[PDB]
Every structure is written in C-alpha cells, then in structure tokens.
Amino acid sequence: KPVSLSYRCPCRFFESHVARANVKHLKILNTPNCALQIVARLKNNNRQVCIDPKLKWIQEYLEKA
Amino acid sequence: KPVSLSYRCPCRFFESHVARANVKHLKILNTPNCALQIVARLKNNNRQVCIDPKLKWIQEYLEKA
Amino acid sequence: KEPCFREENANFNKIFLPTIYSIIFLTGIVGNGLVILVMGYQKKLRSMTDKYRLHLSVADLLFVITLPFWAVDAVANWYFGNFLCKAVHVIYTVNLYSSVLILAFISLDRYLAIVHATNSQRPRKLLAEKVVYVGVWIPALLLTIPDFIFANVSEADDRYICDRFYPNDLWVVVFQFQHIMVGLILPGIVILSCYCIIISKLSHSKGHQKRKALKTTVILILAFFACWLPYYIGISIDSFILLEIIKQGCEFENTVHKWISITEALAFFHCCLNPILYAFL
Amino acid sequence: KEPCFREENANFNKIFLPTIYSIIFLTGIVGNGLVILVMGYQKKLRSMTDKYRLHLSVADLLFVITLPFWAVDAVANWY
Amino acid sequence: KEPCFREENANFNKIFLPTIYSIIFLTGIVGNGLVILVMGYQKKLRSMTDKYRLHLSVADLLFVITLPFWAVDAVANWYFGNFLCKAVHVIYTVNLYSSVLILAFISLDRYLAIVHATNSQRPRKLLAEKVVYVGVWIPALLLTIPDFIFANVSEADDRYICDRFYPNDLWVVVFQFQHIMVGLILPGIVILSCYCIIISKLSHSKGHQKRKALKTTVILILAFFACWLPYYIGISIDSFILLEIIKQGCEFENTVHKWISITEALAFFHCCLNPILYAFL
C-alpha cells in the first residue's frame, strides 16, 4: 500500500526561524515511532507553530532539565 | 526580603504516578529562574497535571528526541 | 505553520468501506472462481486473449482472498500481527502492478494481431507463453521490495495499525511519485500508442469484423482506467500537497485524505469487471 | 446592505474540479485525436455532416489542450 | 492539578502600592530626619528610652531611603541591576529584624526599670550603651547572610524582577518559618512575659505616677504588632499552603498572594508611628 492512509505525521512546518523570547510553553507530542514533533506555541501571535528538531534554541530548552 | 512572592513558579504537586499511555502532550514549560516544569495533559480526564523531572517515562520521552 | 490538526471522524467511512469491500470481495471471488474453473482448469480457451485474462483473474483471486482483511482493518482494529500485514501488503502491491502489466501486454498483443496479421504469429505465442511471466510477474515483484521491507505494525492509541512506515517524508514522496509513474503514465502511454496505431490502420480495411475482439478489450481497458483515474488524481493532489506547493490547505488535506479513501474503495471495482465482461459478450 | 461576506470554502470543489477536468481532458484528447486522424487526415468522410463535426473536433482539441491549465488553476497557484 | 497559572493582571495593586509607598516614604523621611536632627545631633535626649528610639529611627531612615526603589519596582519593573537589588533587600531585612529587636530591648528596659527600681541603674546604662549593639545590630546582620547570597535579578520576559531566588522550595519553606518565628514568636513572647510581670508588679503600688511614661511604650509596641499581625498571618497561611496542606486552593492561593501584597504594603506604617508618637505624647 504505497498510499499510507493512516499514521500521518505533523512533520511539516520545519521552520528554522524560531524565536526563543517569543516562544511560549512548547508541547512535545507523544507520537510513538515518529519524529519528535515539537509544536511550540508562539507568544507573539498566540498561534501554535511547528519547530524543527534541530534548532539551537529548542535544543537548549530541551537540555535545560 | 525574607518572604518571596514575585518569582513563584508553577512547580506545585510534582506527582510521581503518571501513566505514559495516558500522557498525551507533555508540554515542557519554558520559564527562567525555575526548574524543569513539565506539565502533561492527561488523556483519561483531559486535565493538566505536573510530572516530576526524575520520571522514567518523561526521561524516555525526552531521550526519544 | 500549523502542523496537522489531526482529526479522525470517519463515522460514515468506517461502515461504508467494509460494505463495498464485502460486495466487491463476494462477486470477485465468485467470478474469479468460475473463470479459473472454466478457462483455466478445463482448458476451454478458444481465442488468444483469454490466457492474459486468466493471469488477471489469478491475481484478482489473490487480491480478493486478502480483501476481508482490509474489511476487518476498516470496521475493526488490526489483530493479525505483522506477518499477515506484510503478506496482505505484498499481495495488494503485486496485484495492483500485475493487472496493469496484463493490460499493457493485451494492448501489445492486439497491436501485433491487427497490424502484423501475416508474419507475427510465432512471436505472439512466445510472448504469451514464456515472455509473459518475465514481463508481468518479475517486474511486479521487484517493485514490492520496499513493501517487503517497510511494512510492519506500529503502536497508535491502542490501535495496532498495519501500514508502510518510512524514515522520512522524502521516501513517501518518491514512492508515491513512482507509484503514479508506473501505475498510470508509461502503460497508459503504451496502450494509447498501440490503440492509436490500431485505429489508424483500421481505416484502410473495409470495415472488417475483427472489431468484436477489440470491443471487449477497449471496454475492459476503459473501465479499468475509469476506475483507477480519480484515485490517481487524488494521489497526485496529495503528493503536490506534500513539498509545500498547496500547503495552505489543512482541512483541504483532510478532505483529500477522505476522498482518497472513498475512491480507493471505489477503485476496487476493477476486480469484478473482468468476469462480468465474460458473463456478457 | 452588507457588502460581500466573501467566504472561500471550496474544500470539495478544489479537488472535484481537477478530477472532472482530468477525465474530460483525457477522453476529449483521445476522441478528438481519433476523429482528426480518421476523418481529417485520411479523408474518410462520406456525408456532408462529418466536415462540420471535423470543425467541432478541431475546436474541441484546441480547448482540451488548454483544459489542464484550467485544472492547475483550479488546484494550485497560477504559474 | 492545575499548577499555578500565576497571571491575573491585578491593576489595582500597581496603582495602590506606589501611593502608599510614597506617603510612607515622605512621612518617614520627614519624621526620621526630624528625630535624628533633634535627639541624635543636638543631644536633646533625656530618658533612657530615647536612645533605643534613636536606633529605631536610624533603621527607619535606612528603610525609607530605599522605599522609592520599591515604589519603582511596584509600578515599573527593576532597572537598577543586581547590586542595588542586593542592597535594597539586605537593608529591608536588617530594618525588619532590627525594629522588633529594639522593641524587645525597650520592653526589657521597662521590666528592669519598673521591677528593680532600686539596684538596677548601672545595668541599664550598660544595656543602653555597650551590649545593645551586639544585641540588635549584630544578630540582624547575621540573619541577612542568605539575603546577601540568594538575592539577585533574573533574565525575564523584559521585566528583570528583583527577588531572592532559592534552589528549591524546601529553602523557601524553612526561611519563611524562620522569618515568622524570629519576627513574631520569641520577641512577642518576651514582650508579653515581661509586660505581664510589669502589670503584676504594678498593682502593689498606690496608684503612683511612674506609669505615665509606660503608656507611650505600650502604645508603640501595640501599634507595631497591630501593623505587623495580618502580614504574618497571611505568610503563615501561605507557608501552610506550601508543603501540601491546603493544596486544594489555587485561586485561593492567588487571593493569599494579593492579601500578602496588600498587608505588606500596610505593614510599612510602622515607619509612620515612631515620630508620630513624638509629635504627640
């Protein structure tokens, strides 16, 4: 089945431009056997936007634990 | 100031009994001068509950990234 | 920059899908059983085309054996493990590629029969006896090696679903475009080329009675492509939804997924129309 | 006198339109190609009706060679 | 368990706090400058009580010097860096402990004067000159070592809040309990016990006029403790909100926070009543 009806990623908006000052509480979605979908809310626009799992600010925020 | 009121973090009721299957979206709150606050939205009750930073399920979810 | 808006619904889909699966499975297994018993076991074939239709009915019977597993996947949750999931996926992929390679071989055989009606009878028998296997089964089995590798069972919200899982979205885009390519473009171009040559060469004849063999053939091919056209259109729209071209559509992407499921259910009517054409003339 | 209330939707329309455009483009291309190749190139016409149908098929082929541009306009951005 | 959601945009606090702060600052600088100019530089002091009141006015002057920094931190946010934050915090802490240690010393001096009115005059002079410094100022400064260490300014969402930062909530609970204990319990017990001894030993007198000077001291101590009581009750209730006793209240916790802010704004009126008791008699 080369269509893949179910099991869809929120693996889309891999934006490198991430503002750590405007970033609100990031939500790491618990999707098993997928990429780490880190949907981080933005405090500037009050809208949920995806962040790629390679940003330095997101890596520092994850490692600050 | 012997009392302290302005910086008071949402680090209340750090429970150690959280189900990894019931943990839907572990939202890691990004705040300064505070600990690793990880508020996870449950699936059975749809209510946010605090999770301890030494939890094995939270450690595995952080290490999955 | 909103990731998904994941939303399930599928209230009508979860019951409309196994109904269509059940009627298609029942008439497909009945028609393919009668075709295999009459034209394959008793060797009652008279014309040349029926051997290709026997191969198509064999692949059809193989697919409709595993169609009730898709019905159980639709209405209920998958409980058959990973080996049966792999077997169902490889059977579906090999049938989907095999049937359109049968139709390509039938168009090539009709081109050899109509145009070169004098000197081409020995290559027709060789083509339909020995070259047919290495044309329609060997290239079909090499296109399901990633289906052999990447099909497994993952862990959704206690769902145990069966699907192909890829390391990244680029593999999904590449394999969707490859599926579109091999399933539609090149065999459709080949079928169009031989039919254009046949139609251009038929005008020199004085309205010959050879059109009776052509009529069922063009009816079968046109019905197959009419069944498979909206599914391929939906797959092309989803593949262009990927690579950020029409990325404004999120609920539009959900509608695309719903229509892809609906005309993927409706595209399985390509099975039963091969013995239905044998019931008629 | 509210001015427009201009609201988009077209979720089903934006996928239904290129589908119908694709089937109509395909069968128009096939039919008009066979009609032009049989009755226009080989001059296999018998009655006087078929010349008018040849003109109609020529205009039909002219329209359906630009029909996929309408399909691309329907689904995605104009380029 | 909703953790805190500490964002309630309490607008009346931000307009009410600097008004009270400016009023207390103005009356504190005027009254304490007048008291230090009259009884500290011109040597207008007569009795033994006025030296301790001079020390109280010195600590009062020290706190009302840094009160406009608290007003600026109330309506604006902190712009003065970390050194001024440390100095303001340590000055507030030494004044807060020093005032109640002065009042305990005045109560003990009154106990020595009323009961031992014959043989205790040279211990009173020693208690007013020499051992008073190591009595009040030395234990007040040694109680500000965590105030010296843990007071800093954070990197906020452009507020840069000036507050004492602790490694964990256990240190907050321990230091809140220590602040409650040293600020209210032991000096209050000492003052109450020595005043009970004073009242019990005053009934044997034949209505003497030696209790005329006792009225100002009990008025000052009662006004100080009536000013500081609701803030202590609010922070005791907040400390019991911590360590999981009244955990079911969250909006109740925010109400306790607002109560602490309002009562702490009203608890700085102990700076008002030290020269007002010199304005009257």
From Swiss-Prot, chains A, B:
Chain positions of site Important for integrin interaction and activation: K24, K27, K43
Superkingdom in the source lineage: Eukaryota
Chain spans, region Receptor binding: 18-20, 27-29, 39-49
Effect of R8K: Slightly impaired binding and activation of CXCR4
Outcome when changing H17A: No effect on anti-HIV-1 and chemotactic activities
Effect listed in the UniProt record for changing K27A: Impaired CXCR4 activation
Outcome following mutation: K1R: Abolished CXCR4 activation ability, but only slightly impaired binding to the receptor
Consequence the record notes for mutating H25N: Slightly impaired CXCR4 activation and clear resistance to inhibition by heparin
Site (Important for dimer formation): residue numbering on this chain: H25
Record note on what altering K1A does: Loss of chemotactic activity
Region Receptor and heparin binding, annotated ranges: 8-12
SS bond list: C9-C34, C11-C50
Substitution effect: R47Q: Slightly impaired CXCR4 activation and clear resistance to inhibition by heparin
Effect after changing H25S: 55-fold reduction in binding affinity for Link domain of TNFAIP6
Protein name (Swiss-Prot/TrEMBL): SDF-1-alpha(3-67)
Organism whose genome encodes this protein: Homo sapiens
Curated annotation (Swiss-Prot), chains C, E:
Gene induction: (Microbial infection) May be down-regulated by Human cytomegalovirus/HHV-5. (Microbial infection) May be down-regulated by HIV-1 tat.
Gene Ontology MF annotations: actin binding; C-C chemokine binding; C-C chemokine receptor activity; C-X-C chemokine receptor activity; C-X-C motif chemokine 12 receptor activity; coreceptor activity; G protein-coupled receptor activity; myosin light chain binding
Region described as Chemokine binding, important for signaling and HIV-1 coreceptor activity: spans on this chain: 162-166
Compartment list: Cell membrane; Cell junction; Early endosome; Late endosome
UniProt effect for mutating D163A: Reduced CXCL12 binding. Abolishes signaling
Disease per UniProt entry: WHIM syndrome 1: An autosomal dominant immunologic disease characterized by neutropenia, hypogammaglobulinemia and extensive human papillomavirus (HPV) infection. Despite the peripheral neutropenia, bone marrow aspirates from affected individuals contain abundant mature myeloid cells, a condition termed myelokathexis. CXCR4 mutations play a role in the pathogenesis of Waldenstroem macroglobulinemia (WM) and influence disease presentation and outcome, as well as response to therapy. WM is a B-cell lymphoma characterized by accumulation of malignant lymphoplasmacytic cells in the bone marrow, lymph nodes and spleen, and hypersecretion of monoclonal immunoglobulin M (IgM). Excess IgM production results in serum hyperviscosity, tissue infiltration, and autoimmune-related pathology.
Effect of mutating R159A: Reduced coreceptor activity for several HIV-1 isolates
Outcome after substituting D169R: Abolishes coreceptor activity for HIV-1 isolate NDK. Reduced coreceptor activity for several other HIV-1 isolates
Consequence of changing L101W: Increased thermostability
Shown part of the complete sequence: 25 to 305 of 352
Region of interest (Involved in dimerization), ranges: 111-123, 167-186, 242-244
Ranges where the record places region Chemokine binding: 70-73, 89-93
Extra information: Plerixafor (AMD3100), an antagonist of CXCR4 activity, blocks HIV-1 entry, interaction with CXCL12 and subsequent CXCR4 signaling.
Extent of motif Important for signaling: 109-111
Tissue and organ expression note: Expressed in numerous tissues, such as peripheral blood leukocytes, spleen, thymus, spinal cord, heart, placenta, lung, liver, skeletal muscle, kidney, pancreas, cerebellum, cerebral cortex and medulla (in microglia as well as in astrocytes), brain microvascular, coronary artery and umbilical cord endothelial cells. Isoform 1 is predominant in all tissues tested.
Cytoplasmic side: 40-53, 107-130, 193-217
Record organism: Homo sapiens
Outcome when changing R164A: Reduced coreceptor activity for several HIV-1 isolates
Glycosylation-annotated residues: N152
Keywords: Cell junction, Cell membrane, Disease variant, Disulfide bond, Endosome, G-protein coupled receptor, Glycoprotein, Host cell receptor for virus entry, Host-virus interaction, Isopeptide bond, Lysosome, Membrane, Phosphoprotein, Proteoglycan, Receptor, Sulfation, Transducer, Transmembrane, Transmembrane helix, Ubl conjugation
Membrane topology: Multi-pass membrane protein
Extracellular side of membrane: 76-86, 151-171, 238-258
Keyword Transmembrane: yes
